[PDB]
Symmetry: C4
Subunit: 90 residues, 4 copies
């Protein structure tokens, strides 16, 4: 499960990285950062400058937020929880 969500999230981020680096002309690292803060709703970034960027962002958000949060919902509950939980055992 966690393995799958990880894959789906990575592919989603890869797509955003390629899109933004090409259409908005961002360096790869900035394109990945934009993709990440967008899908997690953190939004610490100015908006895309092109209409293509805006249209894609709208669609990217609706399709990717569900996935990204489903993944985060497992990263801390199915992997990060026990580590400290089972560790909460005397």
């Amino acid at each position: 499960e966690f393995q799958v969500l990880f894959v789906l999230t990575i592919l989603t981020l890869i797509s955003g990285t390629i899109f933004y680096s090409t259409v908005e002309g961002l360096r790869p690292i900035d394109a990945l950062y934009f993709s990440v803060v967008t899908l997690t709703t953190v939004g610490e970034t100015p908006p895309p400058q092109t209409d293509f960027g805006k249209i894609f962002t709208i669609l990217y958000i609706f399709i990717g937020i569900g996935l990204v949060f489903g993944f985060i919902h497992k990263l801390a509950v199915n992997v990060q929880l026990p580590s400290i939980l089972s560790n909460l055992v005397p």
Copy 2:
């Protein structure tokens, strides 16, 4: 269900698009983008400049966030999940 939420979300976005393009004077595409990042809480945009814009945004958020997230909660769980889940079957 998914069909209904889709309709309710579209109408909500249409209302925001009309509102912002008129009161804040944004081009339709920018008004739709503002509406979308606002309701998904992504917030990658500067705030409205008019008091009408601010008041409407406050009300728009409280009434639309619940709907938009309910829709997203189905777009990936009732439509996007199986596609890859049922596809996870050897």
Copy 3:
């Protein structure tokens, strides 16, 4: 229930409005808008300029987000849902 959450949310917003209008020197409407986008995590606004503003925002977020979202979780599910749901009955 909905009545109570409404009260708790209003008081929370009133507190933020008073705080920001005084410490950050914002007009009441802008102080309320800042309070609202902050607690809903929309964040369509520049950050507070004073250390008092920042410290208060940190505490305001942790204490108010839970409440605000609990309220929204009822505004659309206990009030906005039926209106269109019961209306989905032929």
Copy 4:
């Protein structure tokens, strides 16, 4: 439970405060504020300026959001709820 989440959240914020104050060169209070609005997805702040800041933010978000929201989910439901709920008793 609430005691534990409080500890995990504090350590997470301490790490972010140290990181941002050092790499992005922010005063401690601004580093803590950035860490807080980032992990709660409020995002009321400009993005990091360095690639290290961006890479760390990406990882910080994925690992810390789950924790921070789990904590908030208890701060208002296991501590803030009764206070006013049990108080809702005539």
